[PDB]
Amino acid sequence: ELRVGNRYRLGNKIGSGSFGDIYLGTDIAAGEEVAIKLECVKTKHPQLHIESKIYKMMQGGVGIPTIRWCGAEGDYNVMVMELLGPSLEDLFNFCSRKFSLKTVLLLADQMISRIEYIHSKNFIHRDVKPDNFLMGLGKKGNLVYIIDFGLAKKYRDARTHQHIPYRENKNLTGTARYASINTHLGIEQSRRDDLESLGYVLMYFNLGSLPWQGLKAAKYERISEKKMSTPIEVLCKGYPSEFATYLNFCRSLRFDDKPDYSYLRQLFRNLFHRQGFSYDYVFDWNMLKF
Amino acid sequence: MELRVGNRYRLGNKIGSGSFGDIYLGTDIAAGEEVAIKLECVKTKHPQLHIESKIYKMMQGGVGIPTIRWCGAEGDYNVMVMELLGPSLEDLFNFCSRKFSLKTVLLLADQMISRIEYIHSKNFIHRDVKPDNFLMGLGKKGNLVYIIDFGLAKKYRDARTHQHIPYRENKNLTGTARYASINTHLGIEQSRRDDLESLGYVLMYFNLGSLPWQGLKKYERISEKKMSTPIEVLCKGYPSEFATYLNFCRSLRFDDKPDYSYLRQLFRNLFHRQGFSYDYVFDWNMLKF
Ligand SMILES: O=C(Nc1nc2cc3c(cc2[nH]1)OC(F)(F)O3)c1csc(NC(=O)c2ccccc2OC(F)(F)F)n1
Ligand SMILES: O=C(Nc1nc2cc3c(cc2[nH]1)OC(F)(F)O3)c1csc(NC(=O)c2ccccc2OC(F)(F)F)n1
Ligand SMILES: CCCCCCCCO[C@H]1O[C@H](CO)[C@@H](O)[C@@H](O)[C@H]1O
Ligand SMILES: CCCCCCCCO[C@H]1O[C@H](CO)[C@@H](O)[C@@H](O)[C@H]1O
Ligand SMILES: [Cl-]
Ligand SMILES: [Cl-]
Ligand code: NA
Ligand code: NA
Ligand code: NA
Ligand code: NA
């Protein structure tokens, strides 16, 4: 039996993010379960406590995870979060690596809103990918949450909204597979870049796998080159134009531009209602007991 | 496009693959509850769904045996619709970071000895005892260990006369090598003893995390490691009941009726000297089914 904070019982690993590791535990007092991020204190570069503050700044936003309790305790900084349903990668695999157009558009609509909300509290996420989107439990079950603000950062000053400066020679940050063209080239990341990664997440959900996925070297140069060489028209072939239009828009944004988040959603909701779907949140994984 | 197999069962996503065929989640539209639905191709080279269904139909009303819901053909497939069960012991071991407490291995051992005995009481050997083939039950029945997958199962005696199948040598391996019996490796026909021996290795795996003969770099090496590793090395640092358990199984003759009760009581006794309550609380109790 393992206790943290003198009120939580620590169970088993249920996750691994960018830093730390996530486990199941129980609020012994409340009588209800939780996610418990742990980072060991003898890491070269501490992070949980910074991330913890990013969560308190996002709190009370649609599909932003609730933080129950934060603090350091012996050898582990710890962060108790509301427990959440499974990730879109988990669901994607449960659905055998293929989602209907309906599920990809219900998700697209929520994914763009969480990204927009982060951008309005002055942060970029920088690792938009299937694992960092999660469905809530029970009441909040048709609601995509966003997680892992471990690589996120301020892109503009909280007071003046002055954008961060443009620069170059940045290292890779974020998952190679879904990075922006610009990140592959070493350009400082901005809002455009978060939404362009969503773009690849959406095509990944349609294709089953991107075409720069599953190459085999002995660096990641290769990924970069085929992502940059793939004409959008060819990546999106056999899928609605709206997916090429979203990505061309994002690829066409400028470093400090405010993306038009209403327009990008609009592509998708208009495609949605033109196909004859009903906005009932029946997803592809709907026969589960969330 | 929606799809009702039979008239009653809505097909959904794949959640399993056993020895043959595949398993999909499905919903019993009428009764509002959920089911698991096995599928095999009609034109498959070695048809066994009809056969497996007969074994389940006859084993029905056995504790920890899944209920047969429905059987028929549809399109290119044979279908057997079953009770929905919860996750395997393999799945759960992994969730517990490949570590099961002694209470859980004993609580598990009791039920696993009984299931095998039940199978044997219905005149079959399973031949692939292993943690993937033991599943916990759902909701009401989350305390219950169930057993699945009789695609490799065999009649070891007549139902009428209890006449034993005859000794045979030079058999090819049937079932997983990691948990096979010493004699299964030597190519002797499989009997009741071998199910119980296989279980002994499962139990010891639950203790160790991994068995000694796994991870190795052409399976002949799995075999020859198993016959270097005497039980008293395998089982060192753990209660002796495990060694006793294994030695006993290795001593049964080909057609012996194992004393399941004796092998059950080795464990029950140790359970109550450790001071545990037989309360059905497993290491994975955090979970919620
Ligand atoms: O990861 C889960 N909950 C979770 N993770 C969190 C991570 C968090 C957090 C809260 C969190 N809550 O706050 C935080 F910011 F600290 O980070 C979870 C719940 S169920 C589940 N998965 C599976 O049921 C699963 C798994 C594998 C394969 C198929 C699977 O089945 C599936 F997902 F397809 F249904 N994962
Ligand atoms: O295999 C599952 N149900 C099933 N299998 C069957 C097989 C059958 C059958 C019925 C069956 N019902 O009748 C039959 F005889 F035809 O053969 C199942 C239910 S839940 C699940 N898995 C996980 O919850 C899981 C997954 C990944 C990691 C950890 C996991 O478990 C964790 F981590 F949640 F504890 N598998
Ligand atoms: C009704 C219980 C829901 C649990 C579903 C778990 C699904 C994961 O396990 C299976 O699914 C894989 C694809 O996601 C396949 O590889 C299956 O063989 C099995 O691993
Ligand atoms: C709290 C809800 C239970 C969900 C457990 C899902 C288990 C699968 O995913 C995790 O499990 C692995 C083994 O159980 C861990 O090693 C984690 O890395 C994670 O992948
Ligand atoms: Cl620019
Ligand atoms: Cl809008
Ligand atoms: Na995380
Ligand atoms: Na949409
Ligand atoms: Na099976
Ligand atoms: Na016992």
Nearest by CB to A26, from B34, B95, B286: name it.
Answer: B286
Beta-carbon contacts of residue A116 (< 8 Å; ≥ 6 apart): A261
Nearest by CB to A95, from B13, B96, B97: name it.
Answer: B13
The rounded distance, in Å, linking the Cα atoms of B6 and B68 is: 14
- First-last CA distance in chain B: 31
| Local structure of B199: helix, strand or coil | helix
Beta-carbon contacts of residue B267 (< 8 Å; ≥ 6 apart): B106, B109, B110, B113, B241, B245
Contacts of B96 in chain A (CB under 8 A): 12
**B197 contacts B239 by C-beta, under 8 angstroms:** no
**Most ligand 1 atoms within 8 A of CB, residue of A147, A284, A287 to mutate:** A147
The rounded distance, in Å, linking the Cα atoms of B250 and A245 is: 69
Distance from CA of A284 to the nearest CA of B (A): 9
The rounded distance, in Å, linking the Cα atoms of A136 and B228 is: 52
Q: What is the 3-state secondary structure (H, E, C) of B92-131?
A: HHHHCCCCCCHHHHHHHHHHHHHHHHHHHHCCEECCCCCH
**A81 contacts A148 by C-beta, under 8 angstroms:** no
How many Cβ atoms are within 10 Å of A255's Cβ, its own excluded?
Answer: 18
Out of B128, B194, B195, B283, which one is annotated catalytic? Answer: B128
In what helix (H) or strand (E) does residue B186 lie, and over which residues does it extend? helix B182-186
The two tokens of residue B60 are 């029905």
Query: What is the DSSP-derived secondary structure letter of residue A197?
Result: H
Greatest alpha-carbon span in chain B: 59
Greatest alpha-carbon span in chain A: 57
Determination approach:
X-ray
Q: How far is the CA of B134 from the centre of ligand 2 (A)?
A: 10
For A69, phi then psi, to 5°, come to -165, 135
**Displacement of CA B175 from its chain's centroid (Å):** 11
B96 contacts chain A (CB < 8 A): yes
**B175 contacts B198 by C-beta, under 8 angstroms:** yes
The rounded distance, in Å, linking the Cα atoms of B25 and B27 is: 7
Q: How far is the CA of A99 from the centre of ligand 7 (A)?
A: 24
For B197, phi then psi, to 5°, come to -65, -50
Q: Which residues pair with B35 in a beta bridge?
A: B26, B83
In what helix (H) or strand (E) does residue B71 lie, and over which residues does it extend? strand B68-74
Q: At what angle do helices A191-207 and A101-120 cross, to 10 degrees?
A: 170
Structural domains of chain A sorted by starting position, each given as residue range(s) with its CATH number in brackets = 11-24+35-84 (3.30.200.20), 85-290 (1.10.510.10)
Q: How far is the CA of B106 from the centre of ligand 1 (A)?
A: 30
Nearest-Cα residue of chain A relative to residue B12:
A287
Concatenating the DSSP letter of every residue in B10-47 gives EEEEEEE--SSSEEEEEEETTTTEEEEEEEEETT-SS-
The two tokens of residue B278 are 């037989």
Long-range Cβ contact pairs of B71-74 (< 8 A, separation 24 or more): B72/B6, B73/B42, B74/B5, B74/B6
The torsion angle over the Cα atoms of residues B115, B120, B122 and B127, rounded to 10 degrees, is 90
Residue nearest atom 7 of ligand 4, based on CA coordinates: A14
Nearest by CB to B96, from A12, A96, A289: name it.
Answer: A12
A2 contacts chain B (CB < 8 A): no
| Local structure of B51: helix, strand or coil | helix
**B196 contacts B116 by C-beta, under 8 angstroms:** yes
Q: What is the 3-state secondary structure (H, E, C) of B214-252?
A: CCCCCCHHHHHHHCCCCHHHHCCCCCHHHHHHHHHHHHC
Contacts of A86 in chain B (CB under 8 A): none
Our answer to whether residue B128 is catalytic in this structure is: yes
The rounded distance, in Å, linking the Cα atoms of B216 and A63 is: 46
The rounded distance, in Å, linking the Cα atoms of B38 and B18 is: 10
Contacts of B14 in chain A (CB under 8 A): 96
Out of A27, A127, A131, A194, which one is annotated catalytic? Answer: A127
Burial of B93 (0-12, 13-18, 19+ CB in 10 A): buried
- Residue A276 identity: G
Q: Is the alpha carbon torsion for A267, A270, A274, A277 positive or negative?
A: positive
CB-based contact A12 B97, cutoff 8 Å: yes
The two tokens of residue B67 are 């209920």
- B196: nearest Cα among B277, B256, B141: B256
Strand A144-146 relative to strand A133-135, pairing? antiparallel
**B188 contacts B168 by C-beta, under 8 angstroms:** yes
Q: Report the nearest atom of ligand 1 relative to the CA of A137.
A: 19
Q: What is the 3-state secondary structure (H, E, C) of A19-58?
A: CCEEEEEEECCCCEEEEEEEEECCCCCCCHHHHHHHHHHH
Distance from CA of A234 to the nearest CA of B (A): 28
